């Protein structure tokens, strides 16, 4: 489906969010989805579908001086 992933109208061939960051490879590091800037949590990227001529901007939250970057227990 040809959808806007961060203002580039790009074609995919993933149906779900989940498969779309996998295919994208934007799973790890620190990367997240914004499906019409609404950002969705990585425990519902499985349960969201992606849909034709939607706008999926791929964000990099700023988590760096964000203290559970890394807590001890």
Do not use: F
């Not at 799973?27 to 579908?49: F, I, Q, S």
């Amino acid at each position: 489906m040809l959808v806007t992933i961060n203002g580039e109208q790009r074609e995919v061939q993933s149906a779900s969010v989940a498969a779309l960051m996998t295919e994208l490879d934007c799973t790890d590091g620190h990367y997240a989805v914004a499906l019409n800037y609404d950002v969705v949590p990585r425990g519902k990227w499985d349960e969201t579908p992606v849909t034709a001529g939607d706008e999926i901007e791929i964000l990099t939250p700023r988590q760096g001086g964000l203290e559970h970057h890394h807590h001890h227990h």
